[PDB]
Structure 1
Amino acid sequence: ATFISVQLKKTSEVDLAKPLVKFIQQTYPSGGEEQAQYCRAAEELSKLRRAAVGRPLDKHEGALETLLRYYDQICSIEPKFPFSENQICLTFTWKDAFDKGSLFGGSVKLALASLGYEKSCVLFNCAALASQIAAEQNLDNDEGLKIAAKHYQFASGAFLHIKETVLSALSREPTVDISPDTVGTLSLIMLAQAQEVFFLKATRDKMKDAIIAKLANQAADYFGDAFKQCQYKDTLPKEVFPVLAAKHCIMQANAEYHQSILAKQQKKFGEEIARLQHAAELIKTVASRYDEYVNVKDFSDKINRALAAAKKDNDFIYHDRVPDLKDLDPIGKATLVKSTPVNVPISQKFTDLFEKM
């Protein structure tokens, strides 16, 4: 399991309660117990922030739901408070997820007094934590596969939501980690890995090789587009580009290998050999170039066993001409994934703490 996940952004603790209570007793002049109800909700909301972003400890669904709930709560608050006009100043400080900084300028962090900044960074951590949960699923288990498929698509859609909204939501230029180009690439990586999970589910369920090949071919397209966005950039961690390049080639080889089984079933023995030769060449390229990052020894042996038997029998029995790769029909593509739209509420059983306001 060589899957890419994203580290969560860190933030400093903020007293969320104090500035909110001061600016509720001014629109609603009360003596307490009536608007003290809403004031208690602000204490709950400051507690919710500390729970959602204050202790990056575990990778279970309790932590994700807490982050999702905190995201829902924030989005539900910008309307009730006319924050387009300047009042209730609140600085959120977030560190870049990827840029370590140096010893000359400290870490890379940004402080902005804007709920758009906060909910962008919170949504980043929702997507990142979802990617970590997906990447740690047992993919030799149907429930692990299902969990990973759902979470990669969620992560893809949340990174994509950040891409489309982060610039208008902020008054400054964002840090690079949440900038449209970076989260656009993260979105496509999660989309690729979701497609890979569907391929692994089809393989595990022993679906028709025609379908497995189109699923792998689609995954190759996604991985290929992802690595092309990371060809000239060093934003993401070191291991992302070679893993993407390897997965692109591995998924093309899986497409060819499963298409070659279809060719054999149709008695197209020349074509089977041509496709196995292509798969072998791709896997040899991955083995020699990306060995530190993937383990293709078992897949290589499977291809070579198939190709040896294929050639032995074609030379001795069938004498099919082995077509050139250019003369083979393209393998189709089947996409089973989509970037999940972010439509608040994204957390379960959501109840807005400021609903009656």
Structure 2
Amino acid sequence: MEAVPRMPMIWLDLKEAGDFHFQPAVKKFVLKNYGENPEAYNEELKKLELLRQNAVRVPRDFEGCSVLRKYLGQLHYLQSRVPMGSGQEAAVPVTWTEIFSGKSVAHEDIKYEQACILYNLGALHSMLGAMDKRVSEEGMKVSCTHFQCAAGAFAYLREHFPQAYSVDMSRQILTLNVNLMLGQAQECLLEKSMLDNRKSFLVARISAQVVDYYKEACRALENPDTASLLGRIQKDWKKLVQMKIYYFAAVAHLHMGKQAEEQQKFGERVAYFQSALDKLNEAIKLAKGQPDTVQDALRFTMDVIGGKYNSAKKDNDFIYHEAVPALDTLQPVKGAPLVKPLPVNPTDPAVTGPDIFAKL
């Protein structure tokens, strides 16, 4: 299982930005309230504008993440000095395209701009994580960190922006995103633990956790309101995710099988391999029409499980003659969480650089 072909990963698209004309409001505030010249601060507003234009047309690569967090940070620094929140004096319309329906959604609130940049940070992390092939030592560790970063960004949005500015950032949908990301992160670690050939029982528990994350995500997908918004996207995700639910349940029981054979419980060895074979077969049925990357993972895994089941059932029928216990009676595999939504510090000076609006 060290060498199993990698499953493909889900990633989210970035939102499309409308206009955020903050400079006339900033200047009209600093003349009216401090009593200064408008044009006294035109380099620190112009730098912000070049920073925003760069963020909303962000390069789809690792450097692009730092670009988004600098702008996220600079946006906070501005709000700390100029009141551009909902209902406040210098508030200007912020417009963004809601990613699933394509509708323009506008809010006279700077936190809306912050929220969308945060979303795109999460989406971009999901992209970087999913394009890697996860074969090298360096792809597996970084993909996992990217997916945790994605989860962390969406989780931060869920907590600090409870007002759903638009339905693509509603709480149940951000929850879906978080669980999807943690699932893919956990999946990366499972692949790593199988490469490192960790204790069979530990691998089983890790795989069981992959199942728990994907199940939560799958639950969210069977929600009518979520299903209607996502549209086709719901059907693509669900078909991959539902398939993976049975696949990693099979991987989990494969390793419960290997543990059983390590402990000389050779009747239970057969039970776990049989169970793994049935669950894998359901996965294969659910995987019809899916790309060859999926099919190659499943057929590699079937030769592993198929071979061990045959070996296990046979030495048991001729040598050990122990009864094959019903799964019911055997202790359930509990998931082992190894991943967490990595917290975002928007105003970390190491990522924001000097405050553009230091003078103010």
Instruction: Look up the SS of the partner of 1:39 in the other structure.
Output: helix
Considering fraction of residues, name the structure with more helix: 2
- How far has the Cα of 1:5 moved from its partner? 0.8
Structure 2 residue aligned with 1:72: 73
Q: Which moved more, 1:184-193 or 1:22-31?
A: 22-31
- How far has the Cα of 1:31 moved from its partner? 5.4
Contact 1:199 1:216 in 2 (8 A): yes
User: Can you give the 5+ residue segments of structure 1 that lack an aligned partner in the other structure?
Assistant: 100-106
Structure 2 residue aligned with 1:343: 345
Alignment CA distance shift 1:178-1:31 (3 Å): closer
Calculate the aligned-residue CA RMSD, in Å.
2.0
- How far has the Cα of 1:349 moved from its partner? 3.6
Structure 1 residue aligned with 2:264: 267
Structure 2 residue aligned with 1:59: 60
State yes or no: 1:123 paired with 2:84: no
State yes or no: 1:42 paired with 2:39: no
Q: 1:146 aligns with which of 116, 137, 141?
A: 141
Q: 1:112 aligns with which of 107, 113, 124?
A: 107
Q: 2:94 aligns with which of 92, 95, 109?
A: 92
- How far has the Cα of 1:182 moved from its partner? 0.8
Instruction: Look up the SS of the partner of 2:65 in the other structure.
Output: helix
Contact 1:69 1:346 in 2 (8 A): no
For residues 177-202 of structure 1, give each alpha carbon's deviation from its aligned partner in whole angstroms, at most 9, with x where no partner exists: 11111111101111111111111111
Contact 2:267 2:316 in 1 (8 A): yes
Corresponding residue pairs, total: 341
Structure 2 residue aligned with 1:178: 169
For residues 243-285 of structure 1, give each alpha carbon's deviation from its aligned partner in whole angstroms, at most 9, with x where no partner exists: 2111211111111111111111111111111111111111110
1:347 and 1:120 map into 2 onto residues whose CA distance is 20
For residues 217-243 of structure 1, give each alpha carbon's deviation from its aligned partner in whole angstroms, at most 9, with x where no partner exists: 111111111101111231331311122
Contact 2:249 2:276 in 1 (8 A): yes
Structure 2 residue aligned with 1:103: none
Contact 1:254 1:279 in 2 (8 A): yes
Structure 2 residue aligned with 1:23: 29
Structure 2 residue aligned with 1:4: 10
Q: Given residue 139 of structure 1, which amino acid in structure 2 is its aligned partner? A: R
2:89 and 2:137 map into 1 onto residues whose CA distance is 51
TM-score for the superposition, normalised by structure 1: 0.89
- How far has the Cα of 1:348 moved from its partner? 4.2
Instruction: Look up the SS of the partner of 2:300 in the other structure.
Output: helix
State yes or no: 1:202 paired with 2:203: no
- How far has the Cα of 1:165 moved from its partner? 2.9
Contact 2:257 2:269 in 1 (8 A): yes
1:309 and 1:346 map into 2 onto residues whose CA distance is 56
1:20 and 1:44 map into 2 onto residues whose CA distance is 14
Q: Given residue 198 of structure 1, which amino acid in structure 2 is its aligned partner? A: L
2:37 and 2:303 map into 1 onto residues whose CA distance is 78
Structure 1 vs Structure 2: percent identity of aligned residues? 30
State yes or no: 1:328 paired with 2:334: no
2:211 and 2:349 map into 1 onto residues whose CA distance is 32
Structure 2 residue aligned with 1:226: 217
Instruction: Look up the SS of the partner of 1:25 in the other structure.
Output: helix
2:91 and 2:346 map into 1 onto residues whose CA distance is 25
User: Can you give the 5+ residue segments of structure 2 that lack an aligned partner in the other structure?
Assistant: 1-6
Contact 2:256 2:272 in 1 (8 A): yes
Contact 1:68 1:347 in 2 (8 A): no
Instruction: Look up the SS of the partner of 1:321 in the other structure.
Output: coil
Instruction: Look up the SS of the partner of 2:27 in the other structure.
Output: helix
1:225 and 1:346 map into 2 onto residues whose CA distance is 32
1:21 and 1:40 map into 2 onto residues whose CA distance is 12
For residues 115-146 of structure 1, give each alpha carbon's deviation from its aligned partner in whole angstroms, at most 9, with x where no partner exists: 11111111100000011111112311222112
Structure 2 residue aligned with 1:279: 276
1:75 and 1:153 map into 2 onto residues whose CA distance is 23
- How far has the Cα of 1:18 moved from its partner? 4.0
Contact 1:274 1:323 in 2 (8 A): yes
Q: Given residue 67 of structure 1, which amino acid in structure 2 is its aligned partner? A: L
Contact 2:69 2:352 in 1 (8 A): no
Structure 2 residue aligned with 1:242: 239
Contact 2:12 2:127 in 1 (8 A): yes
Structure 1 residue aligned with 2:4: none
- How far has the Cα of 1:356 moved from its partner? 3.9
1:22 and 1:46 map into 2 onto residues whose CA distance is 17
